[PDB]
């Protein structure tokens, strides 16, 4: 912490989850969803004795969502409802949760790359025009991964809730032109899972329902390692079928949808998106890099963001890269592939915007923070 005793905070401003903690903490103290919402009377629900404020925000708006019409202020990394966005931060720093409650302590911001410039600039306005912060910085979202991982060279794969990014960094140099986006992220996988359950005859349609299929997604879904083996095991045997309990207690059952939904990351054509799956977009990025740098990117693939948590994703991802390298570099000279040293950093800790390297290793007291000006 500062020699002035000031504290420093990180907000990921995540499109789905705000994630907050003090500088140097190995954990966030508070994880909560970015929902903001208003009370709505619904026929299908008994109105409780629990008091509902005229604006619920954050974790409270998630548990009481059954009474609430909920918005996300952030979509695909761009603020799309600026008033709820203000109210989400006004909740974050208030007496509740991360009670700094003050101008004096510093905040780090994380912006996605290739972000429409006005989005960045309005944040830098309100941080100094409303909270009147004493210290602010906006960091390249990709580099924070490598700071936390303790690396300087590697290609960062960063699938959040809103958008997926790939960003190479080579020995600390930013290579910008090798940036890529893929418009598949945790939100689209959720909507696609809604459709897959609709075929199985469960209807979900309320905004309060979106959180429920997210909780389904997080607990039952996984990425197929050999997609042919998953399909045969679904066709031949019943074991993939598993139960879940909805809020009203309906004991719904879900089957091969557990893997058919996450697979969209490798097959964007299952959703409407026309492109290439995460593995092939990652491979084309490395192949575009200058020829000597490729040798290191294959050894330092680095994973970030909650949509990378799906069981088996590192294993599936490694398979597609090995097969791509066999097909297109070794030109099918199969036995040579024993020489292809490839490695994926997939550390089980993977809310990978932790703050240690970005704050305390960058300043205890310094002229780097932007300041009131």
């Amino acid at each position: 912490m500062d020699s002035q005793g000031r504290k420093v905070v990180v907000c990921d401003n995540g499109t789905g989850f705000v994630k907050c903690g003090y500088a140097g903490s190995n954990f966030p103290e508070h994880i909560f969803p970015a929902l903001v919402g208003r009370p709505i009377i619904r026929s299908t629900t008994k109105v409780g004795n629990i008091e509902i404020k005229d604006l619920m925000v954050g974790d409270e708006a998630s548990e009481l969502r059954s009474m609430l019409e909920v918005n996300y202020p952030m979509e695909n990394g761009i603020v799309r409802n600026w008033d709820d966005m203000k109210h989400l931060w006004d909740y974050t720093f208030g007496p509740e949760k991360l009670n700094i409650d003050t101008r004096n302590c510093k905040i780090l911001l994380t912006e996605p790359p290739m972000n429409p410039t006005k989005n960045r600039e309005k944040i830098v306005e309100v941080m100094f025009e409303t909270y009147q912060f004493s210290g602010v910085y906006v960091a390249i979202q990709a580099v924070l991964t490598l700071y936390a991982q303790g690396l300087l060279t590697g290609v960062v794969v960063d699938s959040g809730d809103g958008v997926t990014h790939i960003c190479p960094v080579y020995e600390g140099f930013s290579l910008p032109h090798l940036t890529r986006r893929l418009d598949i992220a945790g939100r689209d996988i959720t909507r696609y899972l809604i459709k897959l359950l609709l075929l199985r005859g469960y209807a979900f349609n309320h905004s309060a329902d979106f959180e429920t299929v997210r909780m389904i997604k997080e607990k039952l879904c996984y990425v197929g390692y050999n997609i042919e083996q998953e399909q045969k095991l679904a066709l031949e045997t019943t074991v993939l079928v598993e139960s879940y309990t909805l809020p009203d207690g309906r004991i719904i059952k879900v089957g091969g949808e557990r893997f058919e939904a996450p697979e969209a990351l490798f097959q964007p054509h299952l959703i409407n998106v026309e492109g290439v799956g995460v593995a092939e977009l990652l491979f084309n990025t490395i192949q575009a890099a200058d020829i000597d740098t490729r040798s290191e990117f294959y050894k330092h693939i680095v994973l970030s963001g909650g949509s990378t948590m799906y069981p088996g994703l590192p294993s599936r991802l490694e398979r597609e890269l090995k097969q791509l390298y066999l097909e297109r570099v070794l030109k099918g000279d199969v036995e040579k592939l024993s020489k292809f040293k490839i490695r994926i950093e997939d550390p089980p800790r993977r809310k990978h915007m932790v703050f240690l390297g970005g704050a305390v290793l960058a300043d205890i007291m310094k002229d780097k923070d932007n300041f009131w000006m």
Binding site: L146, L152, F173, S174, D290, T293, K336
Partner: protein, 371 residues
């Protein structure tokens, strides 16, 4: 006290102490400027990387050479190379140590003057001397007669010497040398579809040339065989593991030395150029300039290049006298070894340039001690 010996070649700098048998440091004469913005703390970036530090990191660095065709063209890089030479490779304080430098012949006098100035005016050397690269090779090969053939990365030059006396009027120089054979290889590889482009890749094309190319003993016969047999095709493995197959290209590259028309210039090949030099010398000494044809420099390392020379010179010379190329194993460092001899010898100390004389007379002194 011990002198330093330094061969400031375009291509590879070679430096070491006098009286040692081989250079103590060899490193590429490249200064790299990072072409991308750094973003990380703890990176340790700086305004430039040099030598092995640059070669080993070129995926970020726009490599440029300071020396073009044997002329120093950017003193603000060359000063950094010399700085790297003394303090990082040899780890020596220069003000203690006099130094023998090298130059090619027919090099513009402004280059030699600025070079001697930088030595006294910034590194504060006690004393120094400038020797012609060719001349040192006869020291290395231990003899006092021969037409020296020396070919670096940036110059090919020929210097007939007899009875210890040089014949300046018969000096012949060509700018076709190792780098133009690298660009040529980089051009012709486009025929097989390898699009090597930009400076960080040119160093890879060099690594192919430095390992797969060879000199044909009968060019059109090798062409006909390459056009009909895969025996001459070889394969090389790129840094990402993409293998490539090379053939016909392998010998069509260094053939350029014997047919400079391949790179578009109408000067005669090195064989005709060496023969011209002999035929321009005095009649009596020709009979043993056809012996003692001493090769030097890394561009003479190609397999068979000694033999192709012997064949073609024999086809040009009268048959009643005998050609014999001299081609040491050490020839890549022969120039430096020749300096390592010369700087160690007695009878050289009284003919350094010394800082007292330099400040008295200025850099125009080089034309009155050196050759």
């Amino acid at each position: 006290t011990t002198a330093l010996v330094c061969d400031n070649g375009s291509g590879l700098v070679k430096a070491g102490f006098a009286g040692d048998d081989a250079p103590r440091a060899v490193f590429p004469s490249i200064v790299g400027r990072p072409r991308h913005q750094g973003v990380m703390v703890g990176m340790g970036q700086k305004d430039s990387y040099v030598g092995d530090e640059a070669q080993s990191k070129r995926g970020i660095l726009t490599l440029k050479y300071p020396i073009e065709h044997g002329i120093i063209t950017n003193w603000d890089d060359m000063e950094k190379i010399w700085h790297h030479t003394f303090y990082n490779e040899l780890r020596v304080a220069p003000e203690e140590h006099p130094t023998l430098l090298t130059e090619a012949p027919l090099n513009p006098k402004a280059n030699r003057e600025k070079m001697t100035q930088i030595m006294f005016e910034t590194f504060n050397v006690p004393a120094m001397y400038v020797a012609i690269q060719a001349v040192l090779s006869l020291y290395a090969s231990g003899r006092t007669t021969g037409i020296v053939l020396d070919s670096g990365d940036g110059v090919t030059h020929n210097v007939p010497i007899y009875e210890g006396y040089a014949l300046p009027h018969a000096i012949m120089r060509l700018d076709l040398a190792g780098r133009d054979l690298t660009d040529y290889l980089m051009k012709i590889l486009t025929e097989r579809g390898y699009s090597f482009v930009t400076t960080a890749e040119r160093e890879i094309v060099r690594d192919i040339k430095e390992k797969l190319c060879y000199v044909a003993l009968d060019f059109e016969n090798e062409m006909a065989t390459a056009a009909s047999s895969s025996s001459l095709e070889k394969s090389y493995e790129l840094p990402d593991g993409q293998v490539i197959t090379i053939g016909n290209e392998r010998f069509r590259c260094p053939e350029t030395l014997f047919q400079p028309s391949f790179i578009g210039m109408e000067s005669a090949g090195i064989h005709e150029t060496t023969y011209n030099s002999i035929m321009k010398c005095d009649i009596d000494i020709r009979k043993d300039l056809y012996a003692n044809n001493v090769m030097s420099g890394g561009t003479t390392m190609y397999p068979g290049i000694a033999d192709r020379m012997q064949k073609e010179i024999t086809a040009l010379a009268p048959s009643t006298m005998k050609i014999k190329i001299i081609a040491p194993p050490e020839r890549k460092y022969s120039v430096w070894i020749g300096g390592s001899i010369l700087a160690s010898l007695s009878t050289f100390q009284q003919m350094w340039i010394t800082k007292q004389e330099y400040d008295e007379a200025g850099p125009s002194i080089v034309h009155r001690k050196c050759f």
